[PDB]
Amino acid sequence: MKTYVPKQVEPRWVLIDAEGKTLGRLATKIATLLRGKHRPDWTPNVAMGDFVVVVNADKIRVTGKKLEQKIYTRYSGYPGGLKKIPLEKMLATHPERVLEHAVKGMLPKGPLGRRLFKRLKVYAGPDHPHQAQRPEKL
Amino acid sequence: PKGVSVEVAPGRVKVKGPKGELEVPVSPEMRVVVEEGVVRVERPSDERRHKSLHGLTRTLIANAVKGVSEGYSKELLIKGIGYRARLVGRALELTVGFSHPVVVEPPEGITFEVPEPTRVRVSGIDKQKVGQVAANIRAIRKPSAYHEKGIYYAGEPVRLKPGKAGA
Amino acid sequence: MKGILGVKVGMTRIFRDDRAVPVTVILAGPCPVVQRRTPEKDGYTAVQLGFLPQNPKRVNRPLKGHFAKAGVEPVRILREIRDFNPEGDTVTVEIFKPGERVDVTGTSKGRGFAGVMKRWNFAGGPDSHGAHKIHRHPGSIGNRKTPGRVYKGKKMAGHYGAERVTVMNLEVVDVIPEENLLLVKGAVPGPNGGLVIVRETKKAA
Amino acid sequence: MKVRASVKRICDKCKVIRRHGRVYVICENPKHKQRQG
RNA sequence: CCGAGCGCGGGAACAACCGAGACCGCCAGCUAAGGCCCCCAAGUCUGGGCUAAGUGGUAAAGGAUGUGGCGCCGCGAAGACA
RNA sequence: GGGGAGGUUUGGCACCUCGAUGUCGGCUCGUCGCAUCCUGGGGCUGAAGAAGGUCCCAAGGGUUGGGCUGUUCGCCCAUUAA
RNA sequence: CGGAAGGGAUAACCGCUGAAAGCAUCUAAGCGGGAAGCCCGCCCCAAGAUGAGGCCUCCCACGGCGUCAAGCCGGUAAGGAC
Question: Which residues of C touch A80 (CB under 8 A)?
């Protein structure tokens, strides 16, 4: 025949908990959904994978000594511009970040790979913009 | 635990007594339950961390129980020349081996008690929070100084040379 | 956390008590207490402050003659004092009291593209034994064949002057509300006709 | 003795009840304080 | 083995380290090494030991009541270790 | 007497550079490293206090002017909290 | 005029209460002290911060083909440009 290519399907939204969850393991699941790998008709160059609103990311669990160990880094083009922040301080001040960082790196790098990052809203709450559907998951 | 009233909430073991009530939160890896009259604890197994945590925890509760059965007795026997004290109202004042006066003042749970300049006493109802203060006043004025001069638990000087010890 | 706007002039030397002292003269004037900004619909507390009245036909329009009370703007539009909130009346000059150190915002007067040993102050050198050319040249910038990448912010020859800055520690003994003036220790940046604004000190605040 | 790779059991009061992950050698006269650094 | 197999995968990348001789087209399947939580394609497979430091994520002499297993001579209800 | 980091010196090897990458210090602009000289810290002493001896912690900032030598190496003065 | 004054976490280091290991302990749970050092409190840039933030307003709709779905199209509004 000739492999089938999906029409302009309607993006399905989804809601996920967070608290008590494992960071990596959580995102691990998020990503495969930001894309159509969960859907039967996944297609590479398209972007049709569910949007994902995650609640209270402010209470995600992390193993080992991460809490004190794990250090995120940012580099301003400036000399000695290396800035490294510990997972411990990332929670305190704007923690919804940790989950994002964790996922972004777990998605393609190309144009749409950031396009799908946009499909993910994370809130240090819970609580979201109750836009529509949003069937909670497990 | 005669006239004392113990109780266990989630992981934290609340202990109320005629003195008052203190919070004694210790790990849920055993069997904290008040029964018969005295609380008991049963380690999950003979495994390392479990042995340790067991001994520790059982002692923590066993202590903090007496923490409201009056565990105040601790004081300091300050030695030295210009070492004086006078607890005005609520504030413990002293001008020991230091220039300016000093104001040591009450924290929650424990209480001071000056009998006189040279041997201050402390009614501290919290065996953990008390000894803190103990070694903290003692750290306020570290004694020894080769010979004497300073504040002592029941502490004994450790000898060395005065206008000597200098080859 | 108090404050009021100002405009720049003069810097003399009047002799208080005995000693002789340099004195900046700014006109603080009547400044429209036009409305506050609130932490719900903003995120913090802030007050818009106008200034010296001339604005007629030229400025008009939404005016904020709207705002809530009108009053018409100065000629020096308006700014804001952060974490600030007086009473509700259009305040003036003597909002402060003589003999106090405080802080000031000012537009450093422009100068344009200028020298390397002038902007930052390098050293240059070569008068007679060196070369005629490289009098005012930065000499050197980078490395050899590693890392070899020119650094961002390599302190370069360019514009200096037309900037803006706050400043700490300024003792004001003098003030003439009877004409709306404020005379302080003397250091204020800017031309005699530019932006200045007095905020409160931070020696231990 | 402080900071040297031999944290034995010097003066027979000195102990190794390992703390912080770097054995100290704890005594009385503290000219006897070997360390792991 | 390359060179003349800088043709094909792995190995992050990597002439010669492992697989494997490319006539050509297919939108089929066994398989090689490597390999499966996710890049990136296939086991958050099943079963069991150990580890609690990022060891994993590149070093030694040597050191240490680290933590678990295997064992040898005592002391023990005659009463021990503290 | 063994073991080792460090890749700064001084030896060895000779591949991109023989269709060029111009070697000594100084001018001048820095800049990365800590095994840190001043400054903070505490440990300790064959430490009275005054200074010192020593080991870990810690780049935040700082670390001079000259005489002679082409001279980095160097000696010398006048100094520095160094 | 400025480096700072101050809040919080930490260094080695000192201590509290305490187990395994009936004794001990600054330690594996919990508390506390701890540095110019880390983070803010300081000063400029800064929403190309493609999240393109938000406030205070301002003017306001059809005026000509698309009825439906988006285009488009001349002069006006608050304004703005020369």
Answer: none
Residue of C nearest to A81 (CA): C152
Transcribe chain B into DSSP letters: --S-EE---SSEEEEE-SS-EEEEE--SSS--B--TTS-B---SSS-HHHHHHHHHHHHHHHHHHHTTTT--EEEE--BSSS--B--BTTBEEE-SSSSS-EEE-PPTTEEEE-SSTTSEEEEES-HHHHHHHHHHHHHHT---SSS--B--SS-------SS-S--
**Helix H or strand E encompassing A34:** helix A23-34
Peptide bond into B28 cis (omega under 30): no
Query: Resolution of this entry in Å?
Result: 3.9
Q: How far apart are CA A56 and CA C75, in angstroms?
A: 50
Q: Which residues are paired to B52 by β-bridges? A: none
Q: Which tokens hold the place of A135?
A: 């069937």
The β-bridge relationship of strands B102-104 and B110-113 is: unpaired
| Per-residue burial over A60-89, b = 16 or more CB atoms within 10 Å of its CB, e = otherwise | bebeeeeeeebeeeeeeeeeeeeeeeebee
DSSP code of residue A30: H
**C151 lies within 8 A of chain A by CB:** yes
